[PDB]
Amino acid sequence: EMEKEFEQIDKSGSWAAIYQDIRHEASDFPCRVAKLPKNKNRNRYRDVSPFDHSRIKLHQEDNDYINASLIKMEEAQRSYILTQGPLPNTCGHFWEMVWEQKSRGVVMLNRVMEKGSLKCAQYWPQKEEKEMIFEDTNLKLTLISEDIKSYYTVRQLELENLTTQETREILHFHYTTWPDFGVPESPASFLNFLFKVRESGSLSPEHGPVVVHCSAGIGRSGTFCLADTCLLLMDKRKDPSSVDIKKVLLEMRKFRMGLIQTADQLRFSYLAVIEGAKFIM
Secondary structure, eight states, rough: OOOHHHHHHHTTTTTHHHHHHEEEEESSOOOOOHGGGGGGGOOTTTOEEEEEEEETOOOSOOOOOOOOEEETTTTTTTTEEEEEOOOOOOOOHHHHHHHHTTTTTTEEOOOSTTTTESSSSSOSSSSSOEEEETTTTTTEEEEEEEOOOSSEEEEEEEEEETTTEEEEEEEEEOOOOOSSSSSOHHHHHHHHHHHHHHTSSSSSSSEEEEEEEEESSSHHHHHHHHHHHHHHHHHHSSSGGGOOOOHHHHHHHTSTOSSSSSHHHHHHHHHHHHHHHHHOO
C-alpha cells in the first residue's frame, strides 16, 4: 500500500524533495480579478490568491470578489470551497457566500489568535444573546448552541437573509488543537474531526460545498480536503492501493494554489490517509 511508499520516503528522508517536485509540477493559472486594485483590502496574503477560473463569485452586481476557490473533485464526487480566514471588512462577504452557495458547514482549522497574532476576524457570535448583523450583505447570524470538546468545537448557528427573511442552519466545525508550529503529533484527532464533519451531512451532495478555511486557506485546509478525498476514493475504487496522494494533490491545485504549504504537512497528510484507511477498510 502507499504506506510502503511512505516508509521509504522516510527512510530516504526525501520529503522536502518529494514536496518540492509537487510545487514545480503544480498548475499555474491567472488571478487577474484577485489582483485588481479595488480588491486589495479583500485579500489577506499577497501570495495567496484564487485562480480566476475557479474563484467563487459573490452575487453582487457591485463587486463580486472574495478570496475563495471552488475545488471540484470529479471522481470523488465531492466539492469544497476553500477560503482565507475572514478579514475585519469581509465578514459580510464570507457569510453572503455561505448563503449564496447554499453551504451547510464551515470548517475552521485555526484559532482566532495564534502566535500572539490575529489569524482571522471573529466572524461568528460567542454568546447566543448577542447576535451579529452584517449590514453590507444584509445577513444576521445567531449562536444557537456550542459544544466544546477536547480537540474541536461544534456550533449550531442560524443564518438569516434579512432581505427575504429566509432562515438556514449552518454547522460550524472548529478544530481548536492544531499546534502553533508544525503539524499534529497524531492524525488521530484530525481524523475524528474529519469524521464528525462527514457525519453532520455537511459534506453530502444535497447541500452546497462545505466552506473550509484556515488563515491563508491552503495549508491546513489542503490537508483536510486531501485526506477526505483520498479516503473517499480508496472507499469507492476497486483497487484502493491505486489511490495516489501526489496525483490527487496536483488535481486539487488546479483549482487553488499552494494547498499543503510544507513538506511536513505533506507527510502528515500521508499519515492521516493511511491511519484513516485502516479505521475504514
